Amino acid sequence: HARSTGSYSLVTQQPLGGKAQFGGQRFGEMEVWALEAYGAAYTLQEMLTVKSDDVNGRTKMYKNIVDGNHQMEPGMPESFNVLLKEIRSLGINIELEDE
Amino acid sequence: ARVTVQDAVEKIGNRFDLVLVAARRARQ
Amino acid sequence: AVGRMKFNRSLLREEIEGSGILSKDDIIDVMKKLIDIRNGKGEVDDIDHLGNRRIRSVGEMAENQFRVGLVRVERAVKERLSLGDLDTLMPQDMINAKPISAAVKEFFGSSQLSQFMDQNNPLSEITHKRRISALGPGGLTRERAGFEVRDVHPTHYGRVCPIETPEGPNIGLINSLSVYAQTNEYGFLETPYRKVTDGVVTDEIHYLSAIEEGNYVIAQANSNLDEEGHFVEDLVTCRSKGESSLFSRDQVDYMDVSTQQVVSVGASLIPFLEHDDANRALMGANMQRQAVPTLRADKPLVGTGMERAVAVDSGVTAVAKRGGVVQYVDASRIVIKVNEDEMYPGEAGIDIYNLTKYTRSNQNTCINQMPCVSLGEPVERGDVLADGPSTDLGELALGQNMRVAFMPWNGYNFEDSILVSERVVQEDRFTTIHIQELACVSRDTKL
Amino acid sequence: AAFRSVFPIQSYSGNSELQYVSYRLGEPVFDVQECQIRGVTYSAPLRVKLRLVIYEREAPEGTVKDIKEQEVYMGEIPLMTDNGTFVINGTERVIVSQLH
Amino acid sequence: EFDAIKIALASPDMIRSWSFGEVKKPETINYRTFKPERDGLFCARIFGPVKDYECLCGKYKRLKHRGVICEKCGVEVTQTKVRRERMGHIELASPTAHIWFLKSLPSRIGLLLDMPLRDIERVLYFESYVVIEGGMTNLERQQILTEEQYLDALEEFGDEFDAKMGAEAIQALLKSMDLEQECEQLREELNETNSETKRKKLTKRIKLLEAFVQSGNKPEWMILTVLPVLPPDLRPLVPLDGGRFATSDLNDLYRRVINRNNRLKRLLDLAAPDIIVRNEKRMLQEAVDALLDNGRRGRAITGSNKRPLKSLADMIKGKQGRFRQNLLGKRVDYSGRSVITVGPYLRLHQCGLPKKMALELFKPFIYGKLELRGLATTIKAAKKMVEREEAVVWDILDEVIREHPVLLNRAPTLHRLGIQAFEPVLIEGKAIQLHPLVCAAYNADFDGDQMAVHVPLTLEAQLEARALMMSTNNILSPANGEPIIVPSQDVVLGLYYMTRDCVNAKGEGMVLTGPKEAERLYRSGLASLHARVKVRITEYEKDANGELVAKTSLKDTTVGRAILWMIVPKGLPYSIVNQALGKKAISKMLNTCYRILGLKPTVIFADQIMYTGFAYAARSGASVGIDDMVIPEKKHEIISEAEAEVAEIQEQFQSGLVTAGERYNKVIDIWAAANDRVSKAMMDNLQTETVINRDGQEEKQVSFNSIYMMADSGARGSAAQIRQLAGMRGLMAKPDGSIIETPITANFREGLNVLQYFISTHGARKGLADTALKTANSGYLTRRLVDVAQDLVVTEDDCGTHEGIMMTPVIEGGDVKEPLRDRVLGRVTAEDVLKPGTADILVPRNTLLHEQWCDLLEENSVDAVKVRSVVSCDTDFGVCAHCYGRDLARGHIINKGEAIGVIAAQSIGEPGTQLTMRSSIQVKNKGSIKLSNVKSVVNSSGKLVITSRNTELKLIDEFGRTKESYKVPYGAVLAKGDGEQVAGGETVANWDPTMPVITEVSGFVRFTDMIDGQTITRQTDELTGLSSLVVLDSAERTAGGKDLRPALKIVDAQGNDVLIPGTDMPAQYFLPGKAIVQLEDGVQISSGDTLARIPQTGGLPRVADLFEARRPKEPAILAEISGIVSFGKETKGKRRLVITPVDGSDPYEEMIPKWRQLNVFEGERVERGDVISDGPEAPHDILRLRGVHAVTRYIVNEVQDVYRLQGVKINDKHIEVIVRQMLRKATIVNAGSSDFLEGEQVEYSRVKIANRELEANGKVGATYSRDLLGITKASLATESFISAASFQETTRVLTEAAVAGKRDELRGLKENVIVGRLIPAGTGYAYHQDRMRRRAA
DNA sequence: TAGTCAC
RNA sequence: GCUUUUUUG
DNA sequence: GTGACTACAAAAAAGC
Ligand SMILES: [Mg+2]
Ligand SMILES: [Zn+2]
Ligand SMILES: [Zn+2]
């Protein structure tokens, strides 16, 4: 079973499941631990950001790779911002104290 | 081609500074 | 009443019958027995012993569901009759059948115990029909399942298979029953044995349940009798209460019928089981189950003799229901000129057999029957004349026969890998066929 | 026996009593082959006979009439194939005996 | 873009600053169209444009008015992603209380007022009235009130009477009251207080308020009065068919609360009477409660078909909460899954790939490759041509594969060797082809297990993969010390067959000019593979610094050994391969090369080993046949006698002479003996089977049985399997654990009785069930291990600390089972090494003990040293390199940044799979006896008898090396002396397994101070035949008699209570319970003569309970104080036990059980940290009384002993680092900064004191005490609030983080994972340091 | 179901 | 699609 | 001592 790029679920902006209906391989957390254990950090960052949940970068990298570029977007993940908003929604003052 | 970085380890050894500098060199 | 008899037996009562409800004296005796046990009088029970375990086949399950539906409709109809029409009403309209029908239908078609049949192999389907589960609605959960119920009680000998058992989270819960084991009308497990009077084996068979195994002594089938039960030595092995020892000839009085009643039907096909470890036997039985049929099955060079019985007993193969001689053969249907004595007067027809062809299984494997007889040759009542998938001449046959050499070779067989020549693939001795099913619907939306 | 467990049915005060009489099984509507062909349960109908007895109101146990509704359509029951299995819609399934 | 996060409450003005307008109506749509109202809830004027670069009316079209507002619709003409974040606010007519502080169990409002919340709810919903100093003389500010009393007070005072209602009144109260005088008054009260139940409440309150005043938040802000509104993109509202919408629960609650606000606005627009003001205000209160948190207080959904709805918690709390699953565990693209097979022809830094997987993975790279070449024109054209499998696709893909490593991992990635990288080598098939050697790392048998392939994308990821996850770099064990490229399953047998010696064969006795032509003789088939030839070879030595001097000589060896010498690299001696090479040796072989030649020579050596091993295993040929294994004839005959002897024992049981239990022991023992005899016989037969004559007479030699090679080389099997195949299969135990009395007399080759087979089944079923059930509990264990040790990133090189005590090899009674040399290997010294040569320093301090100094110790007899330990490293949220040690991944010291906690957790947890779930001392070596804790006196026999219960004896080598160590139980006579040179096999101490008590002064025994019969019972037992002395206890003897603690009065010839002269006490010895004395009266007893004779788990559970530090059933109580112990009294329960310290806290006692044995008596001069009772001990007391280093050697001893029992070794660094994090809290002894006693971060207290000492010199600061905490509790009480909010009770952590103004520094790891920012552990750690150094510096 | 703090 | 249940390794 | 609140895969199938 192999997968590169295609459809994604409606409920979450993630690839499908199983061999059928154009699924993708599952990434657990034991191997997240193991990747933490190495000096491996960039691979983990890229995989959590652009490979699975990103929508803007997902197309952006695809347009980035076709024209011979493999440069990421050196910025905070977008889901963090909206997450931040939610905490700012209740009554809470949250901010990036040191830039 | 190249697979072992033992030379860099034994001369300027740090598994992070060398990979980062190679990254910023190859980004061009 | 079976529960009532068990209760009375446990309290050393004298009766067999009883009511469907309790009574003060019974609970009184329950306290008396419990207190005596606390004082040290008597001994505690054991749930793992078979005497406390019973099998509910399809019969009582369907009876239970049907009775539940019955009472469910009966309360309503009785109330309506009490408060409704008196003389100008018919039973048919007031009565109802849809709730009972729905309940029994859902029980049959969706349940934690209504298993899905496996069709990949005649052995697989036979051992799935023989399966016994401690799971489902009436059993117990994996979280609350104790470790001991996973284990093997010393009274399993001859009833439930100590080998055939799936591997995974549920091990020791889905063991199937042995070949000779047959159910008892009370629901216990019963197996055959042979009585012995003094030193001569009674040819008559004698069925024995679990509980009566306690107070008797039973020898082993490997024991050699001279001509009419005269043992090789008057000091022979035996077993009384889950233990083995050498006993005098007059000490024993029962013979186990044969050697196979220890193993399951699924695991009785492994040749030379007498030499490998139990774990390998487990794995071998499982891969026996998970076999897939080939396009042209081949007879096993080394076998166990149960192939004929397992092929004929399972209905996948076509068997001559009535004796006679063959009149016409075809690749699709079989015409048998029945014998004049075989037929009965009035009905003077002749046997017809409409064989099946390639059809989807429950595992996408293929089922067909190539007729394995010719014209103008005798057939017998209850004899095989057509061979189905993965069988030949009425004998089971799952894989093929390869020429094998035990030899390390350049590491291509490093740990457990296999080497295959181009020859085996070139003559197509393993190439299988699979059948896939695609269905398309047609709904109507607003557009 | 299952009928016998609910054999006597009596009103509250209407003096009307419904009792089981007889049962018989109809023939399967479709043979197994078409059952897997079309996707229906290889079932058989249930026919039962019921007797209703009514006494005179405010009178001793003397019935007035017997209303006999025989051969009552009592739902559908799957029939086990000779091979020893069932079919629910079009797929062959077996019930593994439970141990408890 | 940042490196720290602060969380706190918000002020209404800056909340409005967050907003961008005010929302009036819940009109999110208008009918007959699908355009949200410009004044409704989905206000585009305040949320942003509806379509990209277009106002609501669209009068500005995307080129001429970008980014500017529109005249018709007051929205800036810009993109729509701003709508994804733009948000507004709603102004509340009346302020309301944030209900979380209401609904938290330690409610912040109630804790701040110390007054219950049940009336707070009532006043909040206008059911009780709150006073605001309604009268200057009657009541206070914080009393509840009733309207009837409100009327009463109105008539009473009226003029000074004022008492508002609800949340607005509460906020007015909070704003009116301060917290300063609160803090000083609480400090004064707690300073002089006695109550303990309220002590904790008051300490928590004072801590909260003193943090709050420093935090800067305002309590009034906590009672919110302006509510923010979320951007609409988060709440899903698709226009369904027929003008419907998805009905987001967020929109339900928005519409509800905004309708309540509108109703209250209309109510206040006509100066409505207060009768209806209360109704609307209360209803709006429940509206805001439901929006903020429904289902917690009122459960008033009222917007669904009687089902709960997502108000706020469902987006934070609950599995639907996206935090800990939508950044922990998920699918991914650019990955595949497939089965694996054996590629025994590949270099070690390669992996194969089926073509289909290759093209499917790389088709994005393929499109770029084609269009760059210009062969393709459009994306569709590229897709269709690559789909059609052109000719150019293959070679261009082969070009792009050459530098693009892929990652491989088995499904249960147990440790860091789970995931690796390779360069792909495209091949044909449908299965992954792996190198054989690396297959040992994955523990991936070829039974059909599946592996997953990933692929990195960016240049950084590819370079990092090449630098780190090549199979070449990851060679040594991260666990302990050894290459994971140990030669694999098959190659070892090939090597063994390579290097043997037959006594005679073709081509023997000649000479060969070198290894070059040696194989020429074999390849032609003119000489045997193994012979007795003499060959001359030239090698090199690394003795020259950087130079390999070549030397040559003629050495006698075999042909095969020359073949191996052909491929052995340059600088290795020949003697290393002169022997019949085995599995363990060749592994060691690699290590030697890795410690001489480097890495690349070692890896090419490994590849050559693989190739030659496979080639000469296949060329050799060694099957297994029925006649290959041979059963000894004697075996059956032998066991026959055993059988006979069993019958004999039966007759002893048949005669009734013996019982079954002793008969059971007899039969099992004799069966074991017969098994040993037959096993020895069959080993003897197999080992020396080969007897081949050489030049006439026959002569034996090592056997050439295929099984014997296959086992003795150690590739597979062991002694047990070979014993099973031929000889006695042994005797199995019945499932309850006890061993059944009948062994299975037959073996596998011979027949089996079915009962024997049936019996042996459940033995296998037991183990298989264990293996099946183990895969869940063990794995979960590792989880608890990672969360406590999640961060632990080394940050600075050296803090200069020089602590630690005596890292020494533990001696286990008999032979010491580990040396010093491995134990300190890879550890950096703390103190300077002083050679035992009177200050002739061998190793300078602050130097790494790798091998050279390790090689300098054996000849110097150094046996005790200390190194730096992470427990003794006093940095701030980190570890020092020169305090950590040498990382085992690479031979050099640990670099800066590499994470330690995760590595440690994985290494500790990996062997869980093999971790199963369920009178005298005789010396054996030569040396001089040495005794520690020397407290012995000369007995009446002239020898020595001890009187200290904790006496311990050791045997020392004549070179100063410790060789033995043994506990000396109390009252054991010594048959030797200290320093006397005694060889092995000579007992020196004797005692009994009941315990003796012995006098210290000579003289008579005038038995006074006891009551005859009452205290001592003259039990004239028939067996002893004399009226002995039995000192029964209070319950055993008469209570009235036993009210003086009788002590026998040993007297001299003068009949006087002789005293220890002037020093301690008279000869009165407090006889304990059941002090059996065989003397009657007045018999001379010398010093050191007997007085009385008192008649006195599973691996996984052990590890798990030890790491929880859960107390045992019987804590062996310890004398936490010095002095001389005394005896207390008897209470209703366990006997009291008072102590008499020679100084300090004299009145010390404890609650001591009497049923269990107490080997403590009055004449016990107790000391600092000596155990009282015997048995298990909790870590708590050991930590709190005998220092941290006591536990450090304790837990490591226990766990390493367990693993050694299971035959698994892990370097001691990994096990103890979690201890440095396990021991992360402390309590405060003396005040000055904290309040009095709160348990907080020990490192925090130390850093606070250390800086304070130089600033406020002389202040005591805070003397403290470093306590422990279970790893679970350690996880719960983490400093980082994000880690707590990840997985448990998210509600509270936000509350007390916001009110306390928590400022997380992201010092951890999981917190960096949660927010999505880069991890600062590996290359990220360099990245952040580089980011910090360049930017903002 | 197994774990937690409060009345 | 989602939730859940079951079979198999 | 007791009670409110809280926490490794493929395939078959039901219920929206
Ligand atoms: Mg495999
Ligand atoms: Zn506009
Ligand atoms: Zn340090």
Side-chain angles (χ1 to χ4, degrees), chain B residues 1-10 13-28, chain E residues 349 423 458-460 463-464 466-468 470 472-473 598-600 890 892 895-896 898 1322-1323 1326-1327 1330:
Chain B
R2 76 279 191 191
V3 65
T4 309
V5 293
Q6 182 197 1
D7 63 308
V9 175
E10 71 95 21
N14 188 19
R15 303 321 192 65
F16 322 102
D17 67 344
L18 62 83
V19 61
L20 282 188
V21 65
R24 56 206 54 172
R25 165 42 201 141
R27 203 67 258 174
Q28 307 170 359
Chain E
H349 66 78
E423 284 189 354
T458 182
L459 282 71
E460 296 90 357
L463 286 177
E464 190 277 331
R466 288 208 79 86
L468 276 296
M470 294 298 102
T472 57
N473 293 321
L599 198 78
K600 290 161 262 163
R890 296 95 169 91
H892 63 90
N895 311 117
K896 185 65 67 68
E898 300 216 29
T1323 182
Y1327 165 81
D1330 292 331

Side-chain angles (χ1 to χ4, degrees), chain C residues 369-433:
Chain C
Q369 284 99 336
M370 273 77 88
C372 56
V373 292
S374 85
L375 266 171
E377 53 188 1
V379 304
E380 282 71 21
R381 214 196 90 253
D383 186 8
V384 65
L385 60 86
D387 276 324
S390 76
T391 179
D392 165 66
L393 308 185
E395 277 95 14
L396 201 60
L398 323 180
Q400 295 277 274
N401 51 1
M402 295 298 102
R403 192 183 184 87
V404 181
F406 292 90
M407 183 177 177
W409 199 63
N410 309 282
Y412 278 104
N413 44 3
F414 158 72
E415 204 179 89
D416 265 343
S417 173
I418 316 297
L419 276 296
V420 298
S421 88
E422 192 269 5
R423 172 73 65 84
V424 63
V425 76
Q426 210 278 331
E427 56 181 346
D428 291 331
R429 268 200 282 178
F430 289 166
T431 63
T432 63
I433 47 171

Side-chain angles (χ1 to χ4, degrees), chain C residues 330-380:
Chain C
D330 198 353
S332 177
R333 66 185 66 190
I334 281 298
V335 164
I336 297 311
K337 169 62 65 66
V338 73
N339 219 317
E340 64 268 10
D341 48 351
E342 213 282 340
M343 61 79 71
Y344 42 100
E347 268 317 295
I350 47 182
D351 291 333
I352 187 66
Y353 289 82
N354 173 81
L355 277 296
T356 61
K357 286 318 191 170
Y358 314 94
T359 47
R360 183 180 182 272
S361 79
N362 299 112
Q363 286 78 52
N364 321 307
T365 188
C366 302
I367 310 104
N368 58 346
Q369 284 99 336
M370 273 77 88
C372 56
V373 292
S374 85
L375 266 171
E377 53 188 1
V379 304
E380 282 71 21

Side-chain angles (χ1 to χ4, degrees), chain E residues 730-923:
Chain E
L731 71 166
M732 161 55 58
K734 44 213 172 293
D736 58 347
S738 64
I739 279 166
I740 193 56
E741 56 89 19
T742 294
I744 298 94
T745 66
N747 73 90
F748 279 175
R749 170 175 186 174
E750 271 77 4
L752 272 75
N753 303 127
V754 61
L755 272 295
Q756 293 156 347
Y757 187 73
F758 172 74
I759 283 158
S760 78
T761 55
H762 53 60
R765 181 156 291 183
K766 173 70 66 68
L768 186 60
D770 189 358
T771 52
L773 61 83
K774 197 204 297 207
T775 184
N777 193 261
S778 174
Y780 203 47
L781 181 139
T782 76
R783 167 159 294 104
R784 274 91 64 82
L785 277 296
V786 72
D787 203 79
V788 63
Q790 50 91 27
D791 46 359
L792 272 296
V793 288
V794 54
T795 52
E796 47 258 27
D797 174 84
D798 168 72
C799 70
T801 194
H802 39 87
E803 316 318 299
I805 50 170
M806 295 299 102
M807 171 45 167
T808 179
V810 57
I811 294 93
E812 302 83 0
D815 295 337
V816 58
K817 75 210 192 311
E818 99 283 1
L820 189 147
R821 276 67 178 172
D822 53 354
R823 279 218 74 196
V824 300
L825 189 141
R827 315 298 294 273
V828 57
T829 175
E831 317 87 349
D832 178 274
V833 165
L834 272 296
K835 160 164 164 51
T838 72
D840 50 344
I841 294 92
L842 170 80
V843 188
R845 74 174 272 162
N846 212 35
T847 46
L848 169 61
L849 288 88
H850 43 282
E851 272 85 13
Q852 305 328 106
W853 321 95
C854 311
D855 294 320
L856 285 174
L857 295 181
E858 58 271 24
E859 77 270 27
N860 291 309
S861 292
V862 184
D863 314 308
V865 66
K866 189 48 183 212
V867 303
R868 309 258 284 263
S869 301
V870 66
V871 297
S872 69
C873 179
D874 43 0
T875 56
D876 62 357
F877 317 134
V879 182
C880 290
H882 293 88
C883 314
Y884 173 64
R886 203 268 324 272
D887 171 33
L888 276 301
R890 296 95 169 91
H892 63 90
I893 206 168
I894 176 58
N895 311 117
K896 185 65 67 68
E898 300 216 29
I900 302 101
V902 179
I903 299 278
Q906 263 163 50
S907 46
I908 290 158
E910 62 86 19
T913 64
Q914 43 267 28
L915 170 64
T916 189
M917 191 165 218
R918 62 172 77 75
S919 190
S920 292
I921 181 52
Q922 199 75 36
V923 68

Side-chain angles (χ1 to χ4, degrees), chain C residues 155-408:
Chain C
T155 52
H156 290 315
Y157 173 96
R159 296 161 176 73
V160 74
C161 169
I163 301 307
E164 200 276 326
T165 293
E167 313 307 327
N170 44 1
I171 174 173
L173 299 182
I174 313 95
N175 45 3
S176 164
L177 73 165
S178 44
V179 295
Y180 281 96
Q182 86 176 7
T183 176
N184 192 254
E185 92 291 340
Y186 285 150
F188 295 130
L189 271 298
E190 191 142 19
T191 183
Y193 290 118
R194 291 203 300 165
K195 298 185 58 52
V196 181
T197 53
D198 48 355
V200 297
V201 285
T202 71
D203 206 289
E204 49 88 19
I205 201 68
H206 206 251
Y207 266 99
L208 197 64
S209 77
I211 51 170
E212 205 169 354
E213 280 188 343
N215 60 327
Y216 279 153
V217 298
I218 175 65
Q220 315 181 193
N222 49 25
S223 62
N224 309 288
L225 321 173
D226 284 307
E227 293 295 328
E228 58 266 13
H230 307 314
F231 300 83
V232 291
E233 198 206 350
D234 308 334
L235 273 298
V236 70
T237 177
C238 176
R239 177 193 63 211
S240 75
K241 279 87 72 176
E243 51 89 14
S244 62
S245 75
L246 193 75
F247 278 153
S248 87
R249 179 178 174 180
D250 59 327
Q251 210 164 353
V252 71
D253 57 356
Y254 281 168
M255 294 298 103
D256 48 353
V257 59
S258 74
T259 68
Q260 295 175 207
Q261 66 251 27
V262 184
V263 292
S264 70
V265 61
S268 88
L269 310 192
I270 293 178
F272 287 162
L273 196 56
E274 288 160 302
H275 299 300
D276 62 358
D277 183 280
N279 311 300
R280 292 292 88 70
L282 308 161
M283 292 327 167
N286 295 115
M287 282 74 75
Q288 279 294 329
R289 278 191 54 255
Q290 284 189 173
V292 69
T294 184
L295 60 84
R296 180 184 58 193
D298 187 81
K299 65 195 81 64
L301 276 297
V302 290
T304 54
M306 301 325 98
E307 305 86 1
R308 299 156 93 87
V310 71
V312 67
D313 214 335
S314 172
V316 174
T317 187
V319 59
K321 312 198 80 60
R322 312 222 312 273
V325 74
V326 56
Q327 194 261 2
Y328 165 77
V329 178
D330 198 353
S332 177
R333 66 185 66 190
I334 281 298
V335 164
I336 297 311
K337 169 62 65 66
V338 73
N339 219 317
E340 64 268 10
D341 48 351
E342 213 282 340
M343 61 79 71
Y344 42 100
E347 268 317 295
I350 47 182
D351 291 333
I352 187 66
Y353 289 82
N354 173 81
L355 277 296
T356 61
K357 286 318 191 170
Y358 314 94
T359 47
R360 183 180 182 272
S361 79
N362 299 112
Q363 286 78 52
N364 321 307
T365 188
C366 302
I367 310 104
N368 58 346
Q369 284 99 336
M370 273 77 88
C372 56
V373 292
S374 85
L375 266 171
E377 53 188 1
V379 304
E380 282 71 21
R381 214 196 90 253
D383 186 8
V384 65
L385 60 86
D387 276 324
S390 76
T391 179
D392 165 66
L393 308 185
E395 277 95 14
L396 201 60
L398 323 180
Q400 295 277 274
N401 51 1
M402 295 298 102
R403 192 183 184 87
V404 181
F406 292 90
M407 183 177 177

Side-chain angles (χ1 to χ4, degrees), chain E residues 339-340 445-450:
Chain E
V339 66
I340 61 174
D445 48 356
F446 294 95
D447 55 348
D449 52 355
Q450 285 176 358

